[PDB]
Amino acid sequence: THQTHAYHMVNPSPWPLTGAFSALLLTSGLVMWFHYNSITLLTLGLLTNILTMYQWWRDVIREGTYQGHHTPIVQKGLRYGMILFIVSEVFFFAGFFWAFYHSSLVPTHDLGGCWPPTGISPLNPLEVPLLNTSVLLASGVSITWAHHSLMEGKRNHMNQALLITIMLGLYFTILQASEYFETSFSISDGIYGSTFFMATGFHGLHVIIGSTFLIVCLLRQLKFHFTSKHHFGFEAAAWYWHFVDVVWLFLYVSIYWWGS
Amino acid sequence: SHYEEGPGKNLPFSVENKWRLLAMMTVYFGSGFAAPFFIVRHQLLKK
Amino acid sequence: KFYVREPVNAKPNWLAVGLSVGASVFMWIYLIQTHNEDVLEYKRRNGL
Amino acid sequence: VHSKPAREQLGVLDITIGLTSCFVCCLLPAGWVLSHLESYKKRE
Amino acid sequence: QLLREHWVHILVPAGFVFGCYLDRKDDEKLTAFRNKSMLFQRELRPNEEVTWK
Amino acid sequence: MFINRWLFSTNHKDIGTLYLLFGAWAGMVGTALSILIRAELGQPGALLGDDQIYNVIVTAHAFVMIFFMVMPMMIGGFGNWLVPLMIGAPDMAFPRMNNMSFWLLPPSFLLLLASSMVEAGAGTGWTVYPPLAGNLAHAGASVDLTIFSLHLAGVSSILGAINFITTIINMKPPAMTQYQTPLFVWSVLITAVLLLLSLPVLAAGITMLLTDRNLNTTFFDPAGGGDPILYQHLFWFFGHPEVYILILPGFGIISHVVTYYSGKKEPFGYMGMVWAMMSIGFLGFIVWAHHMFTVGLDVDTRAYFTSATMIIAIPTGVKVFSWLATLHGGNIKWSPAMLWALGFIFLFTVGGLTGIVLSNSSLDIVLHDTYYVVAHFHYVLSMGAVFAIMAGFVHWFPLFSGFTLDDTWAKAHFAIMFVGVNMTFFPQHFLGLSGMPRRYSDYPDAYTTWNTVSSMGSFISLTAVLIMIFMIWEAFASKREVMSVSYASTNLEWLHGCPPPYHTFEEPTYVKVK
Amino acid sequence: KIKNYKTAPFDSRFPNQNQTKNCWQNYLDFHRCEKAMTAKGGDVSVCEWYRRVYKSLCPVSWVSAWDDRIAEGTFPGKI
Amino acid sequence: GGGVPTDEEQATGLEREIMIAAQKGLDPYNMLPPKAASGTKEDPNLVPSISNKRIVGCICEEDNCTVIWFWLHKGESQRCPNCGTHYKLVPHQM
Amino acid sequence: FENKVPEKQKLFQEDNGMPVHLKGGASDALLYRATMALTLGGTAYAIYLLAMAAFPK
Amino acid sequence: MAYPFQLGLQDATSPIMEELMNFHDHTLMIVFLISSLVLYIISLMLTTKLTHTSTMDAQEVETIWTILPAVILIMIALPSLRILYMMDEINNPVLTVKTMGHQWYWSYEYTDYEDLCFDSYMIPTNDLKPGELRLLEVDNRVVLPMELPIRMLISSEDVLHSWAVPSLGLKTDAIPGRLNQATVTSNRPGLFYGQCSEICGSNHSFMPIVLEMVPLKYFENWSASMI
Amino acid sequence: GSARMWKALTYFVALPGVGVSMLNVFLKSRHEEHERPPFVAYPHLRIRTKPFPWGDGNHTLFHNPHVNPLPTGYED
Ligand code: HEA
Ligand code: HEA
Ligand code: CUA
Ligand SMILES: [Cu+2]
Ligand SMILES: [Mg+2]
Ligand code: NA
Ligand SMILES: [Zn+2]
């Protein structure tokens, strides 16, 4: 009761420091494996940072949805911060898009002056990338249905909406792995191959992050964590998943509808 | 509150003995100054 | 809250805004592209 | 910004000791190193 | 803040420099007869390439 | 207790103190690096043998001063110390990710030092321009370690920028508008917006050549369709934004110290203040290729970019003229901070005018990557950002510690700093006009004169650093507490006592109903 | 034509200072005139001018690498 | 058929007290700007506190870029140093 | 899958003073001691490899 | 090619360098104009003793305070626009030359006819013949005729450089896979000097450039007689 | 009313749409038996400046022997 302001109070935590050290171990493992072919430090880095990010968010869920310090002004700031992270990732991706556009708008002389460079056979965008767009757009409209069913208050329908959007996202990920197994060349093969393989796999890293966020929000909703209006976890999930929808749409139209 | 507050004591380094504190600043900032010296002597050994 | 009823245009329709901006930029890219290959077809068919 | 009399007042001696203290201490690194640079240079 | 208030004062001068610009494009277009008029047949001086611009 | 409070920190005051500690560490690391540089440049010939290690130490110089020194003081340290105590916030919005950015920055310092430890070394300059940092000229872990150090610095800075934007647009008491906060609030807001929208560009570029190095791709190898022009565009579309991150808290700090010690109750033209600051924050992106004029750009885009830089010169000129107007017409207490501020006004003015001289395109065709550019960014960093942060340190030190410096020692420090930087970097003006290119270890007879003079000035700056740390010790030893502070009726950070307590702003302030 | 000349003329197509595209175009249409006139059976030496201009504009290492790549038969252009 | 838990019986702690404060209409935790803009002599601006000391910030001109910060203590009503509006303290213990 | 939030909250907001990063008891304390024993030992192992890459053979 | 106690710039070899230093003198007139303005106003307000700490009125000077920078910045910029627009006339390329920047040295080729290439390096200090220049002398100079526009095709093979001739007054970035155009004109026969101006490794300081200006007659004499 | 409408769109538009797109790809993948293109050692393809930090350093992370030839050829 000594705290008079309605803002947030933090008991000091070790977990920012341990997450920072885990990132340091991650990058040390990256250089140790990229130069001296050792995997032990890299596996240590993955174990450290994944566990640390787990109990960091486990602490924030404890201190938010059972203790109750998350004032409406606090999730107002949380949606500020999530919007800031979203637009930072917009400009991250847009830097990647503009790198692709600089590579593709002016084809260099060794590529034959044509996009794509000759001699390679990029996959047709006609069937399975339309499948990718269909499955991701269906997942997005399903999670909008999930948000409106949060508004309505129908638990089993929220359950099926989440189950179908995780099913769709995992189907997306396993199939894009399948045509990674079913593509004519590799990331080390040319400027065009390198850019779309890196961009699409990097989007794949974001969509597995988004799918794991959907896993964890499902297991919260099974534990009756989210309520009628204080549902910012699913708001962040919806914003991130609509983000990866529109980013996938941009890289789709660019890579596939442009020069194929 | 439960943590003591005031001038000087809200620093990571203890303040009350000024000769020892001077020893702390000399070793700290001297190691900071002598670090790139140690880099450059390290490649001059290594080259 | 000023109005006694919530207006239908109180909050912007973000799906509509995104669709509008995306359609506009897609049509701009498509238009400049078709201008470029029409120019290239012109020169390659008439030897310029 | 007004201040009360020094809680502890350094003597000409103390000020001298300290000013020189770092001066020398902070530069000594340079001393040992810069001094034998040519030796360091020796691959030996 | 004055450029926000008095931004309307540049529209008419913009139309003037645009009007003079398109008139120059008209002279470039209607030039089938540069130095081909039989009244103005003069051989071109060594420091110029066209009779008029 | 020590580990739980300091090593496991969650409060902006202690996080700012540890920012100041690490910033002093990195600052004199950079000072020693610059002294190796300049003592190598003090004698004709090669003092340090090969100039590969010279490229390593100039790379380390640039990295540890730009990314490790003044951003940790001004943005991190001074921002976290002042901003909650300036808007009335008890804490900031997201203090754990604040502390994680803090505790992740010295790992980037460690990666940079380990890159120095690597046999190859980071022989590339501030820029990591391929294919110099490629698989043929820098086959080693040093350049890769610098890239991951940039990754860590970028991640810490992005999450810090999220912290600043959320703590401004959140932690304010509700009835105060955005357009009446103090000027340092606007500085940290616009810088953090620029951070947020600029650091992804750097991260994309450094990941791009990271995949070029380790993933065996060809984004920058023109034998496989690569393009170094792409890297220069990405890096400097980061760079000039990062320049304006690097400079605008100096604007905020000197504006606050001028309206403090000049007797004013307000800065002149606060609407003009905020309008100029968001003008340069907005169009700071579209000026990115004025560092670019000699790579082979089209003439039309060169004209566009130089015109845009003339445009961005306009409101910064409004800023400096209105700085003159806000120091107009009041009693001037001859604090050392005023000496720093007036030196900043002069030296920022001459550095900006020199920058305009660079910004004209054909003179940049002739004078690219030359010590005239060095004199630019040392007149605007080595005394611009440096005198700004010296003014901030000597002004807010009783809030930071509880004790005061010695005014005579601080004025002597200002004199030493001033004379050292001027008769260092005015010979650098002469060197750039005479025209030797940068990143050179040895120079001919024409350049020997100014090299010797400016090296002697660099050792003057060494003496200045020694006097600075001496007076820090002298302040902490004399420990003179502050009986009273003037202008506390208009300064929020000064009215919680010197120093402010651990738990400030328990009750949020009573804003007028209006 | 069979005009006498000494140096590569300025291309009105490319005022810009980048001539990588210029010599790449000169290389490709040199190979186009060579295949077109081997097709029609005409005087194949009329594009000695384009042969000289690409030799002048882009460097000896690049033209040697591209010539060897064509000779071994793996040229990455539309030739 | 209820499905999702309703936040009035889900939220506990500070969320619970701020929601019951919202539904009774009184805001004691300063989530809202204050009321009773009356800085006369007969009535001052009332300021609630749990301590003996309390900060105030006067926006004492309309659309003023300046904000005037000063402390007050329990007792006589505090005044503004450049406009003269009056502020009074009341203790509320929550 | 019934509701578990309102029974475990009374085991969190009781003011016994021991910190919020240890509310769960011994299991979370065991995980804390485990992650403390590896975030510092791994860092020592990280800089050791950096030292071995620094000093050649 | 610089002289001790140099405070200004190199004297011109090219006419574009001539009006470029005229424009540069104009910009110097501007910088001391503004610097003297701010110095005298600072001196005035430090030498004053009158106080005015009221509410300053604002909306009275911003129009002049924005139009005087408007006019001064545009009358600096229009010479800049003119000089940048006349960097690229329709060239009369009497001579062509390609420069190929190699790892730690340069390569120069004359390839208009009778294909010729050579590599230019750094003359060591102990190998320096007496009277010559340290850090500028090159064992194989590059020759060009006076009073002619000659085209410069700049590129590099492994690391980016910058071919810099401040005496001619130009600096072109040599990029792998990319060649740029520089038109060189000269007014005086004789030696002219430059260097690299990008970071390029552990002999970055040691790739200098020397252009000696000869007539076309002595140019073709050297071209015939070098065989 | 919003939640019902979104439920109806998911069941009657999105799920049938995914069914049709899946059926399109599934029918195509049964008819298409792609004629692996002949190997051409293009100098801009399969670039290896440094070995990968896994396996033999010559196989990509998602290598497929049937469609992804090495710098030397197909593996069969
Ligand atoms: C604090 C950091 C800082 C700041 C503010 C600036 C500000 C500016 N900089 Fe610069 N710059 C750097 C840091 C900075 N820069 C660095 C670090 C590099 C090189 C890095 C590297 O090489 O690796 C660089 C490089 C750099 C170059 C590249 C040159 C080259 O290497 O080829 C150019 C050229 O356009 C340039 C231009 C400018 C301009 C036009 C401004 C302007 O914003 C200045 C505006 C300030 C003013 C004060 C305007 C003057 C106006 C008045 C005084 C009012 C009255 C006058 C009139 C009305 C005319 N900068
Ligand atoms: C913040 C940026 C910054 C700062 C301060 C400086 C400061 C100095 N620089 Fe730096 N310099 C650069 C950024 C900076 N430089 C960059 C970016 C380059 C180009 C690199 C490249 O080519 O890629 C460069 C290049 C550069 C060169 C060119 C080397 C070469 O290319 O051959 C030289 C040589 O004279 C030089 C000298 C100096 C000197 C003598 C100082 C002196 O001013 C040093 C004195 C300054 C200080 C000591 C700072 C004060 C701080 C403290 C005292 C501690 C702080 C602690 C608290 C506040 C508590 N600099
Ligand atoms: Cu080539 Cu430096
Ligand atoms: Cu810039
Ligand atoms: Mg460069
Ligand atoms: Na030297
Ligand atoms: Zn008032």
Q: Which residues on chain A are in Cβ contact (under 8 Å) with F506? A: 2-5
Query: What is the full DSSP assignment across G1-23?
Result: -----SSPPPPSS--SS--HHHH
Q: Give the number of other Cβ atoms within 10 Å of residue F130's Cβ.
A: 28
Contact A253, A97 (CB under 8 A): no
Closest to F36 in 3D by CA, of J198, J133, J162, D40: D40
Distance (Å, whole) CA J210 – CA J215: 16
Atom of ligand 2 nearest to the CA of F390: 58
d(CA F299, CA F296): 9
Active site (annotated) includes residue F291: yes
Whole-Å CA distances, J220 to J112, J114, J139, J224: 12, 11, 20, 6
Whole-number Å distance between alpha carbons of F49 and F55: 12
Within 13 Å of residue K46, how many CA atoms lie on the same side as its CB? 21
SS3 content of chain A, % helix, strand, coil (to 5): 75, 0, 25
Contact partners of F by the rule of 3+ C-beta pairs under 8 A? A, B, D, G, H, I, J, K
The CA–CA distances, whole Å, from F414 to F284, F383, F464, F465, J33 equal 31, 11, 8, 11, 27
Separation of alpha carbons H94 and J227, rounded Å: 101
Measured CA to CA, the distance from residue H56 to residue F510 in angstroms comes to 5
- Minimal CA–CA distance to F296: which of F235, F227, F217? F227
d(CA J76, CA J95): 34
DSSP F494: T
Do C and J count as touching (3 or more CB pairs closer than 8 A)?
no
CA of F47 to the centre of ligand 6 (A): 5
Burial class (CB in 10 A: 0-12, 13-18, 19+), F226: buried
Say if residue J19 carries a ligand binding annotation.
Answer: no
Residue F395 a catalytic site member = no
Q: Record the tokens describing residue G75, joined without a space.
A: 């040229």
With beta carbons under 8 A apart, name residues in chain F contacting I52: none
J199 CA closest ligand 2 atom index: 22
Report residue F287 CA to chain centroid gap.
19
Q: Which two tokens stand for residue A156?
A: 């089993």
Question: Which residues are placed with Cβ below 5 angstroms of ligand 4, an ion?
Answer: F 240
- How far apart CA F378 and CA F386 sit, in angstroms, is 9
3-class secondary structure, G49: helix
Any idea what the Cα angle at residue A78 is, between residues A76 and A84, rounded to 5°?
110
Q: Take residue J12 and report the two structure tokens written for it.
A: 């011109």
Please name the helix (run of DSSP H) or strand (run of DSSP E) that holds residue F39, with its range, or none. helix F12-40
**Contact state of C18 with A246 under an 8 Å Cβ cutoff:** yes
> What residues of chain G lie within 8 A of the CB of F298, using their CB?
16
Of F66, F301, F380, the residue with max ligand 1 atoms within 8 A of its CB, to mutate for a pocket test, comes to F380
* Residue of minimum CA distance from atom 30 in ligand 2: F439
Helix, strand, coil percent content, chain H, rounded in steps of 5: 15, 25, 55
Q: Which two tokens stand for residue A143?
A: 């999670």
Q: What is the DSSP letter of K62?
A: T
What SS3 class is residue H37? coil
Q: Which residues of A237-257 are buried (b: 16+ CB within 10 A; e: fewer)?
A: bbebbbbbbebbbbbbbbbbe
Which structure tokens are listed for A222? 């099974």
Nearest alpha-carbon partner for F214 in F115, F148, F128, F135? F135
Beta bridge partners of F316: none
F125 lines ligand 2 (CB under 6 A): yes
Chain gaps in chain D, named by the residue before each (C–N > 2.5 Å): none
Q: Is I17 left (phi over 0), alpha (psi -120 to 50) or beta?
A: left
3-state secondary structure of F98: helix
Atom of ligand 1 nearest to the CA of F438: 22
**Interatomic CA distance for residues F465 and A109, integer angstroms:** 54
Nearest residue of A to residue F157 by CA position?
A: A88
According to DSSP, residue H53 is labeled: E
Q: Which residues contact J124 (CB under 8 A, 6 or more apart)?
A: none
The residue written with tokens 């590059």 in the block is J142
DSSP string computed for F204-215: HHHHHHHHHHTS
Experimental technique behind these coordinates: cryo-EM
Q: Whose alpha carbon is nearest atom 1 of ligand 3?
A: J161
Is residue F117 within 8 A of residue F149, CB to CB? The reply is no
Report CB contact under 8 Å: G76, A114: no
C5: which 2 tokens?
């009823």
Contact flag for A and F (3+ C-beta pairs < 8 Å): yes
The number of angstroms, rounded, from the C-alpha of G16 to the middle of its chain's C-alpha atoms is: 19
Contacts of F263 by beta carbon, 8 Å cutoff, 6+ apart: F330, F331, F332, F333, J51, J53
* Residue C47 burial (CB count, 10 A): 5
Instruction: Report the amino acid identity of residue G17.
Output: Q
F336 cis-preceded (ω within 30 degrees of 0): no
Classified as helix, coil or strand, F467 is: helix
Nearest Cα residue to atom 2 of ligand 3:
J204
Other beta carbons within 10 Å of K59: 16
Q: Which two tokens stand for residue F74?
A: 């001004």
Tokens for H88, please give them. 């009074």
Decide: F209 in ligand 2 pocket, CB within 6 A: no
Residue type for position A64 = G
CA distance I17 to chain A (A): 11
- Residue spans of the domains in chain F: they are 1-477
Resolution in A: 3.5
For chain J positions 9-48, those within 8 Å of chain G (CB to CB) are none
- Buried b / exposed e over A20-59, threshold 16 CB at 10 Å, is bbbbbbbbbbbbbbbbeeeeebbebbebbbebbeebbeeb
Reading the block at residue B34, the tokens are 């002598």
- Output phi, psi for F244, to 5 deg: -75, -30
What CA–CA distances, in Å, run from C19 to C14, C24, C26, K6? 8, 8, 10, 18
Report d(CA A3, CA F506) in Å as an integer.
6
b or e along B3-31 (b: 16 or more beta carbons within 10 Å of the residue's beta carbon)?
eeeebbebbeeebeebeebbeebbebbbe
Q: Answer whether F37 contacts ligand 2 (Cβ < 6 A).
A: yes
8 Å CB contact between F113 and I47: no
> What residues form DSSP beta bridges with J108?
J99, J118
Q: Is H65 annotated as a binding-site member?
A: no
Q: Do residues A214 and A162 touch, judged by C-beta distance below 8 A?
A: yes
Decide if F256 is catalytic: no
**Structure tokens belonging to residue G35:** 């295949």
Paired strand residues for A217: none
Q: Smallest Cα–Cα separation from G67: which of G34, G39, G41, G36? A: G34
Residues contacting H75, CB < 8 A, separation 6+? H89
d(CA C35, CA F86): 56
Strand order, beta sheet including J180-184:
J116-120, J105-110, J95-102, J150-156, J180-184
DSSP B1-47: --S--STTTTSSS--S-HHHHHHHHHHHHHHHHHHHHHHHHHHHHH-
Gyration radius (Cα) of chain F, Å: 23
Chain breaks in chain F (C to N over 2.5 A) after: none
SS3 K16: helix
Could you say which ligand is closest to the alpha carbon of residue H56? 7
J64, closest residue in chain E (CA to CA): E2
From the list F488, F421, F39, A238, the residue with the least C-alpha distance to D2 is F488
Of F388, F443, F341, which is closest to residue F37 (Cα–Cα)? F443
Residues 6+ apart with CB under 8 A from F302: F293, F361, J84
Question: Which residues, at least 6 apart from J68, have a Cβ–Cβ distance to it below 8 Å?
Answer: none
E53 C-beta neighbours (distance < 10 Å), count: 10
What whole-number distance in Å separates Cα of residue F340 and Cα of residue F70? 16
Please state the φ and ψ torsions of residue A197, each to the nearest 5 degrees: -65, -45
Of the candidates F101, F108, F116, F156, the residue annotated as catalytic is: F156
Residues 6+ apart with CB under 8 A from F32: B32, B33, B34, B35, B36, B37, D29, D30
Distance in angstroms (rounded) separating the CA atoms of residues B42 and I51: 12
| Nearest partner of F53 among J195, B34, B37, judged by Cα | B37
Whether K43 has its CB under 8 Å from any CB of chain G: the answer is yes
Query: Does residue F438 have an active-site annotation?
Result: yes
Helix (H/G/I), strand (E/B), else coil: J174: strand
Q: How far apart are CA J115 and CA J170, in angstroms?
A: 26
Task: Give the Cα-Cα-Cα angle I38, I44, I50 (nearest 5 degrees).
Answer: 130
Q: How far is I28 from chain A (nearest CA, A)?
A: 9
Whole-angstrom distance, CA of residue F503 vs CA of residue F492: 15
What phi and psi values does residue F119 have, to the nearest 5 degrees? -55, -40
Which residues make Cβ contacts (< 8 Å) with residue H43, sequence separation at least 6?
Answer: none
Q: Where in chain A are the domains?
A: 2-69, 70-260
Q: Is H83 annotated as a binding residue?
A: yes
Look up tokens 């830089």; give the residue: F309
- Determine contact, residues H73/H48, Cβ cutoff 8 Å: no
- Look at the block and give the residue holding tokens 């890769």: F144
CA-nearest residue, atom 47 of ligand 2: F31
Cβ-contact A111, A238 below 8 angstroms = no
Place of tokens 């190979």: G31
Q: How many helices (H) and strands (E) are present in chain D, helices listed first?
A: 2, 1
Mark whether F473 is an active-site residue: no
Q: How far is the CA of F383 from the centre of ligand 2 (A)?
A: 10
Q: How far is CA I48 from CA E22, F103, F320, J134, K41, in A?
A: 74, 20, 51, 45, 44
- Let me know: does A165 contact A215? Beta carbons within 8 Å: no
Separation between Cα atoms, residue F74 and residue A210, nearest integer Å: 36
Q: What fold characterizes domain F1-477?
A: Cytochrome C Oxidase; Chain A (1.20.210)
In angstroms, rounded to a whole number, what is the distance separating the alpha carbons of residues I32 and I26? Answer: 9
Residue J110, classed as helix, strand or coil, is strand
Q: Which residues of F are annotated as a binding site for Cu cation?
A: 240, 290-291
> How do the domains of chain E map onto residue ranges?
1-51
- How far CA J214 is from CA of F116, F149, J222, in Å, comes to 48, 52, 10
Among this protein's residues, is F316 annotated catalytic?
yes
Q: Are J152 and J112 in contact (CB under 8 A)?
A: no
In the block, tokens 């006694």 appear at: C4
C-alpha to C-alpha distances, F421 to F355, F372, F453, J34, nearest whole angstrom:
17, 15, 11, 21
F436: which residues sit within 8 A by CB, 6+ positions away? F370, F371, F443, F447, J2, J195
Chain breaks in chain B (C to N over 2.5 A) after: none
Q: Which residues contact F273 (CB under 8 A, 6 or more apart)?
A: F183, F186, F255, F267, F319, F322
Whether residue A253 lies within 8 A of chain C, CB to CB, comes out as: yes
3 state SS of J182? strand
Residues A66 and H5: beta-carbon distance below 8 Å: no
Please tell me which of the candidates F175, F265, F491 has its beta carbon nearest to residue H33: F175
Pairing of the two strands J142-145 and J208-214: parallel
Strand order in the sheet with F510-511: F510-511, H53-58, H68-73
**Distance in angstroms (rounded) separating the CA atoms of residues F407 and A142:** 68
By CB neighbour count within 10 A (0-12 exposed, 13-18 middle, 19+ buried), where does F236 fall?
A: buried
- Tell me C30's DSSP state: H
Q: Is J165 helix (H, G, I), strand (E, B) or coil?
A: strand
Strands of the sheet with H78-79, listed across from one edge: H45-49, H86-91, H78-79
Does the Cβ of F249 fall within 6 Å of ligand 1? no
Residues of each annotated binding site of F for Fe(II)-heme a:
61, 378
3-class DSSP assignment, residue F118:
coil
- Rounded to the nearest angstrom, the distance between the alpha carbon of F494 and the centre of ligand 4 is 36
Which whole-number Å values give the CA distances from D11 to D15, F352, J26, in the listed order? 6, 45, 57
Locus of tokens 């500020």 = A80
Tell me the torsion sign for CA atoms D8, D14, D19, D24: negative
Which atom, in ligand 2's list, is nearest to the CA of F70?
1
Are F484 and D26 in contact (CB < 8 Å)?
no
The helix/strand/coil state of F370 is strand
Residue I28 bridge partners (DSSP) = none
Nearest one of F343, F287, F341, F342 to F314, comparing CA atoms: F287
Structural domains for chain J: 15-85 (1.10.287.90), 95-226 (2.60.40.420)
**Tally of CB atoms within 10 A around F284:** 22
